Amino acid sequence: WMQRGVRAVELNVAARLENLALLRTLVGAIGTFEDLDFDAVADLRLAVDEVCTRLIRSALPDATLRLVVDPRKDEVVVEASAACDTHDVVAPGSFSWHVLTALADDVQTFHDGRQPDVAGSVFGITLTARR
Template sequence: MADTKTIQPEQDRANPVVELRIRATPDQLPVLRALAAAIAVHEDFDVDSIADIRLAMDEICTYLITRSTEDAVLVCRLQYVDRTLSVAVSTTTVDAEYPNTRSFGWHVLDALTDSVDTRQEPDPAGYLTTLEFTKTNGTYS
């Protein structure tokens, strides 16, 4: 069995991070939605919140995939801390275009989540673009 200290010594064992790296292609969207929903189910989110999380994941991943560079990888990190699911999805995009906060898609994200944010930094292949959202679990176990 692997010694986790040698894999990620700085990992916070009380609040683990789930990370998935996949091709930045539309056929991978069901995998990402399923991952987010599985974590939400595991953390006892209600059915409506799980649906919100799946839709928010779909929206941010679609945005990134449609702007990604050829052969890009989508990196999705999910962490549940203090009754809040935090999701960050990153990829290399071809341009420095930020999401239009007046678009329908952004309003959908804003309505489905507790917070949504965008970060971008120059990358040799384009721009490393990250979209993040949080969703608080209103269910008390």
């Protein structure tokens, strides 16, 4: 993605529960490599694991979990997405949604089921952590 900063990293793994441990390790390796407040990093790590776990639990067969970590000066943006079996993996007012909104400064979702094939099944969540 071009709007991504020069230090961004995109990770892709099979959207399988067996890969959640690898994702936690790599996200932790990146945060240590970064500059944000430590308390903000620890919260963000928990939120990214919640996002990845909910996406992979809802993932269609043979889907890919696509994770982008974009560390900027002001903030860190983390985007995760996968082809899922539901139009909304973190419903308004759900416990998951409240957890994410407590741990990240901004939480946004994206999904367009009008797109044909697997793109119409993709659900994404973007977390932003500042300062």
